[PDB]
């Protein structure tokens, strides 16, 4: 079949017009500016209520509330200021893998190895949290969940397919099928018009929410990738793989922009998050400690060494007050 | 500090409930069940009272067992196996009457080798069950066993063929000083696997208690 060499030459042509536009890297333009210096963050709070390995968490839009889930079979809502527990929701399938928080603050999402994404309603007239919906239709474990609006939700599953749903009816409004492995993470754009996902294929895909078709493909990693986040401007994103390296890609240029890695680290990445000004990049490792890099100069700015096991989840508030890290140690900590 | 006291009281009540649930969920035995294609994994479930992950609950001599079966969900096993780190035991199931079918026992041995040498399971015990013994009794008297084991040299009958298979199982784990493998022979009838599971779990728990106190 000539289709094999046709696709090969098409890929060659794609890679042809991907380095002609790379006249210079991010460096040699950012070398003139002064460095950040030293970042000395301290553990302001320590949230200690979980009795198992914490797997994911999410920040509220008001930057005071958060939600966290572990293998204990419960997910709980933390008041990040006074260190108080607002809600404690026990879920049926204890094999949790992800969490999400509605931008309106009314709903929360979950989902793990039970192939089902559960939607819970926080603000009811009966005083308790009750499960509002059970999205079913995936054949693999739910890896990530993000909220688009109060009624829409995009989910990633360990069955190679992503799905944009409609919570009102419960049916898959759109299905995204373009990978060959398992999709691990997910991130939404600031305007919620498009999103990006990354898979065990060591590749990431840019999906348009409306048309439901992949726009661009990004490669460059060597192993399974586990974390995705957008730049605050929405024109770039960052990835972290088992390769013990992270890297930032550009949407407009459509290739790798700059990688962050060091010789000492040999353990893979588990989480990625950015900062409001887009100057420093967080990164959670399996070394039991997380690092803070200068996003422009690619320099180790700080180390938030405060955990006993690998850090599994990591988040930064919307107003930039603090950064929260959660690990298998069963304690999640706030740094400012 | 005016109506924050009620919030503190609510948080304390939530803490009490979480602590009680965690204490209740720590004295309950959790076993992870693995098998193969038509290897009898569903067969052993019948003797006990009894989507992607299947959970079975049962009780024996005032002891609560939760068996987790992961055969339904198919995906990259590397990406979700560590969720089961810390289980009390791994119940492995092998079909004894698949030596000549197709190759099957070679795949079963490859899977046993892969699962027995995981960094997450470097200190976990394995209870191995061998099914289809009754059919294996007369499946070997009409066909040589050398088909699956060309380097074998022994008389073709059940009594030492079963022993050869059992000894072939034990030569896979490299953590001989850290974990102990329990092997049993059973059929569809002769319901005595529950005693074997109970005894293996008792031994594992005793060893863990001995390791806790500084001994062992």
């Amino acid at each position: 079949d000539q289709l094999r060499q046709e696709a090969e030459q098409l890929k060659n042509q794609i890679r042809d017009a991907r380095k002609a536009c790379a006249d210079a890297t991010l460096s040699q333009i950012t070398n003139n500016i002064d460095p950040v210096g030293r970042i000395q963050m301290r553990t302001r709070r320590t949230l200690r209520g979980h009795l198992a390995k914490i797997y994911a968490m999410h920040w509220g839009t008001d930057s005071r509330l958060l939600v966290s889930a572990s293998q204990d079979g419960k997910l709980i809502i933390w008041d990040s200021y006074t260190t108080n527990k607002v809600h404690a929701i026990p879920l049926r399938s204890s094999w949790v893998m992800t969490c999400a928080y509605a931008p309106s603050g009314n709903y929360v999402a979950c989902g793990g190895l039970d192939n089902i994404c559960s939607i819970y309603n926080l603000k009811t007239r009966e005083g308790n949290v009750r499960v509002s919906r059970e999205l079913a239709g995936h054949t693999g474990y739910l890896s990530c969940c993000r909220f688009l609006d109060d009624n829409q939700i995009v989910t990633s599953s360990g069955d190679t397919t992503c799905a944009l749903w409609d919570i009102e009816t419960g049916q898959q409004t759109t299905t995204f099928t373009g990978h060959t492995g398992d999709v691990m993470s997910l991130s939404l754009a600031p305007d919620t018009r498009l999103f990006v996902s990354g898979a065990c294929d060591a590749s990431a895909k840019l999906w348009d929410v409306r048309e439901g078709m992949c726009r661009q493909t990004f490669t460059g990693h060597e192993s399974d990738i586990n974390a995705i986040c957008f730049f605050p401007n929405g024109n770039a994103f960052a990835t972290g793989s088992d390769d013990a390296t992270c890297r930032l890609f550009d949407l407009r240029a459509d290739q790798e922009l700059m990688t962050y890695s060091h010789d000492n680290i040999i353990c893979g990445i588990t989480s990625v998050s950015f900062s409001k000004s887009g100057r420093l990049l967080l990164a959670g490792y399996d070394d039991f400690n997380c690092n803070v890099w200068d996003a422009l100069k690619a320099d180790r700015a700080g180390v938030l060494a405060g955990h006993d096991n690998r850090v599994s989840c990591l988040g930064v508030t919307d107003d930039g007050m603090a950064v929260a890290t959660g690990s298998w140690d069963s304690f999640l900590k706030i740094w400012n | 500090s005016a109506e924050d006291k009620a919030a503190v009281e609510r948080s304390k009540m939530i803490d009490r409930n979480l602590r009680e649930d965690g204490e209740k969920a720590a004295r309950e035995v959790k076993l992870l069940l693995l098998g193969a294609g038509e290897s009898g994994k569903s067969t052993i479930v019948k003797q006990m009272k009894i989507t992607g992950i299947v959970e079975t609950h049962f009780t024996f001599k005032d002891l609560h067992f939760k068996m987790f079966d992961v055969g339904g969900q198919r995906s990259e096993r590397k990406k979700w196996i560590h969720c089961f780190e810390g289980v009390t035991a791994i119940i492995f199931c092998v079909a004894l009457s698949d030596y000549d079918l197709v190759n099957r026992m070679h795949e079963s041995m490859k899977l046993f080798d892969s699962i027995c040498n995981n960094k997450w399971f470097t200190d976990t015990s394995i209870i191995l069950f061998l099914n289809k013994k009754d059919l294996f009794e007369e499946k070997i008297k009409k066909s040589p066993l050398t088909i699956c084991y060309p380097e074998y040299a022994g008389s073709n009958t059940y009594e030492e063929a079963a022993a050869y298979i059992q000894c072939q199982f034990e030569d896979l784990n490299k953590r001989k000083d850290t974990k102990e493998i329990y092997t049993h022979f059973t059929c569809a009838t002769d319901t005595k696997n529950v005693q074997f599971v109970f005894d293996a779990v008792t031994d594992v728990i005793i060893k863990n208690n001995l390791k806790d106190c500084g001994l062992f």
Partner: single-chain antibody, 232 residues
Framework: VQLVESGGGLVQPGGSRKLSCSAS????????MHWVRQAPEKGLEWVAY????????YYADTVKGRFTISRDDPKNTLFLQMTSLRSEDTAMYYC??????????????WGQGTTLTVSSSDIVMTQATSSVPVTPGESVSISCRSS???????????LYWFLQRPGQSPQLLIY???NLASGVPDRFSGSGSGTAFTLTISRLEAEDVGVYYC?????????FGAGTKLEL
């Protein structure tokens, strides 16, 4: 969601009474419960409070040592035992649910209450006016005053504005002096500063007539205002 009170009626002076409040439709075990009374010709008056889990009990000076509160979670009821009744206890009693966490709206749902007829350092809340006649379709503003600043150091003011319609139980209009309750039209609003608060209603419509009340939740006891009667 509903709360039904029972046990009221005629009580001889110095007697005893046992008032019940049955809840249905919500999780009674996660709600603190208040008893609040209103005289036949006066405003409301906070009476007693019991927390979630029976941890805390609060009374007022007039009731301490005579009124005790209790609850039964499995049976989902609230109970008030009253001893040595005086003529000052002639009132109408309301069983109010209230839940406290970050962002909650306490004092939202009130029961129908029961009548009780007997034969024969606190923060001061004041209302400037006792009656305001206004034709429908206009905008009205009503002022409440306090003897102390209600702005806590954390950054919120614990002021509550309620309405009682003629022949109806009260309901929450705005909580914490700037937040509108649920099931309330957006035309209502509230504002103010330390010891001076104003509730403003725009585009007045029918059924808005009644009595407005201002109350503080800075410390116990909670003190009620005089209430302004808005009538045509």
């Amino acid at each position: 969601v509903q709360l039904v009170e029972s046990g009221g009626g005629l009580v001889q002076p110095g007697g005893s009474r046992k008032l019940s409040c049955s809840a249905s439709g919500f999780a009674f075990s996660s709600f603190g419960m208040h008893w609040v009374r209103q005289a036949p010709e006066k405003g409301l008056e906070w009476v007693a409070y019991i927390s979630s889990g029976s941890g805390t009990i609060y009374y007022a000076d007039t009731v301490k040592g005579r009124f005790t509160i209790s609850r039964d979670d499995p049976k989902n009821t609230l109970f008030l035992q009253m001893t040595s009744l005086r003529s000052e206890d002639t009132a109408m009693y309301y069983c109010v649910r209230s839940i406290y966490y970050y962002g909650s709206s306490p004092f939202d749902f009130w029961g129908q209450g029961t009548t009780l007829t007997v034969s024969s350092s606190d923060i001061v809340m004041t209302q400037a006016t006792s009656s305001v006649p206004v034709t429908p379709g206009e905008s009205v503003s009503i002022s409440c005053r306090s003897s102390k600043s209600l702005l806590h150091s954390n950054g919120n003011t614990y002021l509550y504005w309620f309405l009682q319609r003629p022949g109806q139980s009260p309901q929450l209009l705005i909580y914490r002096m700037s937040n509108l309750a649920s099931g309330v039209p957006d035309r209502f609003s509230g504002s103010g500063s330390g010891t001076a608060f104003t509730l403003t209603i725009s585009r007045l419509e029918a059924e808005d007539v009644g009595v407005y009340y201002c109350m503080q939740h800075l410390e116990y006891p909670l003190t009620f205002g005089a209430g302004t009667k808005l009538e045509l």
